[PDB]
Every structure is written in structure tokens, then in C-alpha cells.
Amino acid sequence: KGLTPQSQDFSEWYLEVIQKAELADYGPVRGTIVVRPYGYAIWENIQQVLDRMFKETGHQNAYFPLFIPMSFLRKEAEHVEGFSPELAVVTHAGGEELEEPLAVRPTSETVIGYMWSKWIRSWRDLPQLLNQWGNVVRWEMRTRPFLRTSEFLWQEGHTAHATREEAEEEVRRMLSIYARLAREYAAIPVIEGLKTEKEKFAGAVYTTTIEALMKDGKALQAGTSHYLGENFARAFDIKFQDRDLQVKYVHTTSWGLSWRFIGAIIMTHGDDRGLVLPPRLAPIQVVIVPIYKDESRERVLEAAQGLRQALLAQGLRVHLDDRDQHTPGYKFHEWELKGVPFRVELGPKDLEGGQAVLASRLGGKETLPLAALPEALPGKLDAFHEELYRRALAFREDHTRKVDTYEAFKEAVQEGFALAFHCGDKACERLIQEETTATTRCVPFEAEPEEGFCVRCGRPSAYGKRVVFAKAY
Amino acid sequence: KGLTPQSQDFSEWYLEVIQKAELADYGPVRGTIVVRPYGYAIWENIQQVLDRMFKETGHQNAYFPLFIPMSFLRKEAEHVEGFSPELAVVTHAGGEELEEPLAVRPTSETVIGYMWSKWIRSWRDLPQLLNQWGNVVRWEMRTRPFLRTSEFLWQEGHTAHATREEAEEEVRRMLSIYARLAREYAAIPVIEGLKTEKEKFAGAVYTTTIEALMKDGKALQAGTSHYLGENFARAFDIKFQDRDLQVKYVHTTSWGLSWRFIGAIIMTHGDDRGLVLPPRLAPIQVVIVPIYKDESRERVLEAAQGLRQALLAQGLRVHLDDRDQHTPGYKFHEWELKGVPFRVELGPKDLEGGQAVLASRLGGKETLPLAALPEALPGKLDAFHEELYRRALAFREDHTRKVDTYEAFKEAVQEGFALAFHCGDKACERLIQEETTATTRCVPFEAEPEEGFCVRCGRPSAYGKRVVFAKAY
RNA sequence: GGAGUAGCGCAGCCCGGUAGCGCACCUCGUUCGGGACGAGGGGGGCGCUGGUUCAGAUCCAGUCUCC
Numbered sequence A, B: 001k002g003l004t005p006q007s008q009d010f011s012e013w014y015l016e017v018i019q020k021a022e023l024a025d026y027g028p029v030r031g032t033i034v035v036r037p038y039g040y041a042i043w044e045n046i047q048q049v050l051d052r053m054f055k056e057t058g059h060q061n062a063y064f065p066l067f068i069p070m071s072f073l074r075k076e077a078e079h080v081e082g083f084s085p086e087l088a089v090v091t092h093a094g095g096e097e098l099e100e101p102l103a104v105r106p107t108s109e110t111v112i113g114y115m116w117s118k119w120i121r122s123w124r125d126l127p128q129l130l131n132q133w134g135n136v137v138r139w140e141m142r143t144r145p146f147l148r149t150s151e152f153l154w155q156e157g158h159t160a161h162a163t164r165e166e167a168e169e170e171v172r173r174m175l176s177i178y179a180r181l182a183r184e185y186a187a188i189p190v191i192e193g194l195k196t197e198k199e200k201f202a203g204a205v206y207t208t209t210i211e212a213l214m215k216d217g218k219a220l221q222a223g224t225s226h227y228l229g230e231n232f233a234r235a236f237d238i239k240f241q242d243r244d245l246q247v248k249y250v251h252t253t254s255w256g257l258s259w260r261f262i263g264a265i266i267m268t269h270g271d272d273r274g275l276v277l278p279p280r281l282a283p284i285q286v287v288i289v290p291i292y293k294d295e296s297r298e299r300v301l302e303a304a305q306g307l308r309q310a311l312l313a314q315g316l317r318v319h320l321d322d323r324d325q326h327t328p329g330y331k332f333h334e335w336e337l338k339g340v341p342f343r344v345e346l347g348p349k350d351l352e353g354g355q356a357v358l359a360s361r362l363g364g365k366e367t368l369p370l371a372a373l374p375e376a377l378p379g380k381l382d383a384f385h386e387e388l389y390r391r392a393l394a395f396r397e398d399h400t401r402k403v404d405t406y407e408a409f410k411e412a413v414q415e416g417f418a419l420a421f422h423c424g425d426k427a428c429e430r431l432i433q434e435e436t437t438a439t440t441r442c443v444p445f446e447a448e449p450e451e452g453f454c455v456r457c458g459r460p461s462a463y464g465k466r467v468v469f470a471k472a473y
Numbered sequence C: 001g002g003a004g005u006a007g008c009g010c011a012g013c014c015c016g017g018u019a020g021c022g023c024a025c026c027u028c029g030u031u032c033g034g035g036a037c038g039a040g041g042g043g044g045g046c047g048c049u050g051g052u053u054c055a056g057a058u059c060c061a062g063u064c065u066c067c
Ligand SMILES: Nc1ncnc2c1ncn2[C@@H]1O[C@H](COS(=O)(=O)NC(=O)[C@@H]2CCCN2)[C@@H](O)[C@H]1O
Pocket: B106, B107, B108, B109, B138, B140, B146, B147, B148, B149, B150, B151, B152, B154, B155, B156, B157, B201, B221, B222, B223, B224, B226, B254, B255, B256, B257, B258, B259, B260
């Protein structure tokens, strides 16, 4: 057996590793997946980190309805125009046909708007810092596990502010949280930037995003944060009486990160041997594979369990593979496939000298005393993270490139990122895409100030800096 | 304040307190609610407790699809017959009409069955211990916030076993977890028992349950655990080859507890002054109300902020009410309404004095040295729990009655529980319900062994013990 | 033009006989330091609908699907 190497067919590698590592499986209904324990464990860790971050910045969780009245989706022009196509609709319910058909939420701005309309009255009711962990449906054509599924789990944040300034700071504060999650926890390097009009969220004034580069050279948006201005406030009549006794509109923001983030993790660190899970988000950090023969079994398994206690004490996430129906050889492969950062080999020769072998998913084995191991793993885990990150950063720089000639652009968007100048015209954008399939990823905040001429039509450059292009997922 | 007393109109008291305490609000769509932060905070605490308990008993979370193919619901006769009426159906999706209409999950046995069908192959593949935190829809007529909503959050556990024995032990293991949650965490006394055929879960062999008595004398089922036998295993072809070369059907179980549990909390401890939340589930256990005047606003708030830290240090869920725009007496009523177990009053004089006033939502009021507070609180939070539970016990004992005549029975089901004998015949049960509206709550596990004659038709008693009847929610 | 046959990957169809092989899975034993070995087993009725025939994955007709 094996696993299709990434160089042969990335897409297949992806689908297979997801299946073999038991992250998910295809669900009966079109475009859906079933998240099995190991995969969902990853999602829970992402929830915990984000939830903590969201709570430290004063947000509170709440839960709004799954069904949204079709009329609501219409109160906002741009919004309904961008989602109308991918909606799932409930028409029949309880035996009878519904008065007004209900839409399965694709996003919750509208329903929350409606409620905000009745909750916000004075300036004492602001800011409104809400978050919701849940599922959403979007009947999209062409789907991929995690990256794009009919139904998907995510977190959708919604805030309402008295001033445009406070709302914009919120929009950034969250995109920074998402970026912190990607860098400090997933070891995924990202580019914090701004989407161009053509690519922004339907109903938003502007959209900020984090863009990651997958090992196959394709870009992937892993999280978005939108400044909605007064679009929904106006659509749903969300006003309040400020301290100057003046009745004005609130400024709302929206932000979300779906389980697509799991896909980003897979396609950023995964290799031909399978998954490589970042330590800080991995369900199992250390897997202990006991090694023995009939006569060694008893004492070896006893040592292993002792080591399992010493490791749990250090607060590490450890798993002991007691399965007797498989050989060490076999187990080694399974756990490498599953992407566990460290495996500890405990054999009788090892137990003999009070030591053990520590194998790292990144490569290499080493012997250490059993007593040391507990206090040493945490630090090694951090180095593991540091390594994964510098490797990904390296991979990114090796695939980022400034282009001045359109012929150089075509070459660069085959390898990865293409830093080009653009006129800032939706018409040109569409053209470049129809021709190269590459799209606008974002206008990076930290990008160097530059002026030039559109890489394709020649007209004076826009944005005051090169834009990031790439073939994306 | 306009808080309808429970003695005047319980239902109104309920709806109002939910609204005024900001636990929830009505959603735009029929029969739905919007869980606001404070209410959802309660739900999160319930999740944390149950999840820890599920995890300690080897279960793992996963996530199955929201949409279920209509055909699946049909593979199990009884199941589709009991849910068919209350289904919401997606027919239109993505612009076109679906080949097969999709049902919004009312429960997940079927979809999981389908998946189990393809995952389970050998006994080494069992038991399957799965849990899923999510939402489900059930278009039911007559709804009440939390107790019965169109859409609702819950936890639904699904297990598959090799033997009937293991599956039945699982059924009880979970019902015990639910009961532990109700008693040790919600301070709600419950009766662990078995539903009669008429009242069991559609598709289950038998149904176990926890029944609580609300302050209005009505019974409420707060959690259920079902032994599904091979009903779904047979419907979805879920077999495996055992240690005896024999191929057989797995025995599955199902269990779930919805946010209805929040309603049980409200209607069990709530009073005319509002909510009374059990300490171990209360989002705020202590509220520090600083009292002052400009010339003292400095030291009081200083002391208050100090106490806030001291209490968080103890791991207590505290909240400081700074709000300079409200009188202390206003704040007192606000937090008595929201059910905070304790209130710490810090005034001007209390600085030089070194003491403070600790007031409990249960009538306690004492003066303690600010230094003693942090250490004393945890212990008081416990006595609080014990008291809450003690009262609910007394209430229950006072509204339970052994009846031997049908007349006495009609009397007893107006006050609460009626411990009567029954023939065990569905026809008779339906009769009693049509005449008194009371139903069968459960055949208690611990009930004393008794033989008699049906309270209504006179025929020999079934179950070998008295059945629990009551008007339920 | 090829192809739909066990969870996966395939052979069998010409020259009909009541379905087979690899991997997986069950049993037993031997194994166990980089995906073990042997023997014994369990599971499908061949995309679907006709027809010919004692008998149809196999022959005939037609319909659905993927490349
Ligand atoms: N509309 C509703 N609103 C609120 N709560 C509701 C609703 N419907 C059911 N419940 C409550 O949820 C719990 C599970 O309900 S049950 O008894 O039908 N059982 C089931 O649905 C099985 C067992 C768990 C997974 N599927 C029960 O304890 C039941 O009270």
C-alpha cells in the first residue's frame, strides 16, 4: 500500500490522507463530510484557543436561529445577491407548506441584525460583542473536504459599535487573532491583507483576510474579518440614542473562521508519509509504542503505563498504543500517518538501561533516560513547532516573487505567489483570472509602498503597492 | 417591577423571568428562541460538566451531517412514524429542486447508522462510543422557551456494542451521568426510571429517563437514555464478526440532554424575586456591589477591584458591578433576578472596618472580614447547593402522593406526583390521559416492590411496583 | 472508445452450470526493535430493466453512470 505522493497528485494525496488518518469520511448527502473523532479533536483545540482569545477581548457567545426568513436575506441587496445562489431552503415543515420559505443560514448577519434592532436603544447597549459557534449551509458547486463543504462548522463573530473607528479597530483586532492562531498555534505563515472590491464579502464595506500558501503552491484564505459599516444597521433599522441625544446608526463588523482551517493545517505541513500536526493543536502529542515479545510484554507494558502517567503529569497529550494485534513496525507507520509529533519507543533493551527512544515525525531518533523524558518533551515540542514554522516560511519565500512583465506573472502563479501591480479595475481582474485562473489574494498591509503600471493592461497602478496574486482554493 | 408571581400565573412568570433576566428572547421564526449571553453561559457550563463526564467514560466527540436523506428516516419503521410529523424539509437547494428531499435532522440515529455500517467490521471495532454537540430541528406544535423549541441545542450520544449486556450497561451509565448532573450540579432532584411502552423513544426497545418536578407541580423529563437493541443495526446492516467466528448485529444505545435542562433549572429553583441558579452552573457566583459617594468612590472601588482579583484567584466566577449610573438598591434587584448565589457589599465604612456584607440569594446575610471571604466562599457555595437541593427535595416530597383510588389520583395529579398501580395496558394509559391529562412519567428503578390493582381499571398491577404519574410539560 | 462484479483494487464474460483473487476482516498458532507468516474462515449474487434458456456477470434488447 502507500499514499499518493504530493508531487504526483496533490488533490489525491489530500483526499487519501484525510481518509487514512481518519480525520473525516464522506457523508451520504452531496458535498458533506463526517468528522471522525481524531479530526474533530483538532477542531475542538481550535475552538479552545479562539474561544479564549475571543473572551479575553470581551466577546460573549450566544446562539441565534438556524432558519432565516427568506425576506430577511432580501433586506440587504449585495448580501442576498451573493448568497441567493447557494441557499438550501425549507419549504415543507410539520406536514404543511410554509407561509414563507425558510433559508438554512449561510451566514447570520441578517438574523442578528433583526435582534439587534430590538436590543440596541441607547449607547449603553454598545458595543455589542457577540460570537457564535455553530454550523452553516452553503450549497456550493465543486467541494473539497474541509476547504469547501455543503455544511460546515465555524465560528461567526458579530459586533455592533457606536463609531466607525471602534468598528474598524475591531475588524483588525480579530484578523490579528486569526493570524495569531495560524502562526503561534498552527505554525502556518499567513499574509494579513485587504481583499479587493471584486473579492470582498457580499454586504461588506471592505474585507480583511489571512492568506496561506499550501505545499502545492495554491493560496488559501483561512479567515476573514469584515467592516460592514452601516449596511445592516440601515437594512434592519439598528439605531441608538448617543450621549449627544442624537439618534444614529451603529457600525457592525463580522468575522469567521471555519473548519477549513483544518485543511490549511493539512496542506501546509503534510508530507508524503502523511499528516504532520502542529504540537499546539494536535490531539495526540506523544504516542507511546510499546515493543515486546511474549515474555517481555508484561514488564514492558507496565513501564509504558508508568511513562504514560509521568507524561500526563507534565500536562502533555499522550496516547499509549496497547493494541496487541499489530507490530511496532505497523504502529510506527500509523502514527506517522496520523501526524503525531513524537513517538516514544519502549522496548525491553530500553527498559533494561532505564532509557527509551524518541522519534520525531520531522525526522530522527534519539535515546534518553526514562526519567528525563517527561521534563524534556515540552521543550522539544516547542522546537518542533519552531521548526515547522521556519520550514513553512522558507517554503513561502521560495515561492513568492515580484513580477513586472505579464509573462513573468504567468510563470509565478504556477509556482505560488505573484507580487504584481494592478489597475484596481474589476474588469481587468476578471480578465487576468479568465486567462491565468489566478486571482487577487489581498493587498497586504505591511507591503512596501510602490507605484507602477498594471501588470496586464498597463494603466497606472492602484493600491499604492503590489497586490498578491495566486491560484487559490 | 412587574414580575408576575408564580402563584398567579406560572407560565407568565416563566416567560417573563426568561426575558427580564436576559436568558433568551424570541426569534423571528415560529417556535424558536435566541439565546443571549447569560443564558448561553449556563449552557456552556452544562456542556463542560457533561463533556468531562462523557470523556472520563471513554466517549469521543464527532460531528455528523445536519441534512438526512428522507429515505434514511424510512429504513426504521417506528422511528419514521414518530418523527415524520415534525420534520422540516429542504426541497430546493442551490437554485434547483433536489432529487431526493433532505430532512433537517430531528435526531441522528439513522445517519450514524449508515456510517457505522461502513466503519464497523470486527468486534475489535467496538464499542463505538460517540457523542455530538449540536442543534436539531423538530417542528412541534405548542412551544415554550427551552422546554420545547423548533430548533434546540443538545448533546446526542450514540454507542454501538458487541453484546446486549454491554449496551444496557451503557444505557444506565449515561442516565446516571445525567442524574449526577441534575443532583450534584443543578441541585434538581430527579427520579431515575423506565418509560412505559406508550411513552418510549420512537425506534427504541426501551427508554430510561430522569424526571423532575417543577415548582408549579408539573413533571418534566430532563434527559433520556435509550437501549435501541438491533433496530438500527438491522435497518442499516451494521454487523461484525465476533471472537467466535459468528457474524452478528451490534447493539446500539442513544442518549441526549437538550437546553431544556436550563428550563428545569429555572422552574425548579426560581421564585417570585426571579431566578435562583445553582452555584456550580451559575455563570456568576459572586457579584460585588460597591457602594459609595464621590469622596469615597476611590477607596471603595479600589477595595472592590481588589476583592475581584482575590476571588478569581480562588477560581470563583465573580463579577464586579461598577456601573456608576445605578443605585445599589437597583443593582441588588438586578442580581437577585438573574439568580446570582452571592452578593458582596463593599461600602465606605467597610474599608477602615476591614469587613464586608455577604448576602445569599437564599436569605443569608453575614458580616465577614474581607480577607476571610476568598477562603470562606467556596465552602459557602457548597452549603448553598446543599440548601437549594434540600428545598427541591422537600417540595417534591410534599407534592408526591401514593394513591389507591382513582378519585385520590385525580386529586394528586393536580398537586404533583401520583404513585399509582397500573395494568400496563396502553389502552388504559391513553384513557387516564384523556380523563385527567396526566401521563406516565416512569416506572422508578428504586421504587418499593408492590402488587395491587390498576388505579383505573382494577385489573392486576404490572411492573411490580407503583408507576409515577403526573401532569407533565 | 473503455468501464460499472465483496470495504478497496481487480479477474471471470468469447466457448452459460449457480461467483473468484489481492488487500482488509474473523479464528488458532508462530511472531513483535520499521507496515510479519502459515493454516483455517466470514462477507457479494454481479449498475438497473427486460427478454432467450433447465440454467445468464456471462447471450439478446434497452435504460442509468464515470472517465
Ligand atoms: N423540541 C425540543 N426542545 C427541547 N428539548 C427537546 C425537544 N425535543 C426533545 N427534547 C429533549 O432532548 C432530549 C432528547 O430527546 S429524545 O428523548 O427524543 N431522544 C432522542 O432524540 C435520541 C436520544 C439522544 C439522541 N437521539 C430529551 O431529554 C428531550 O426532553
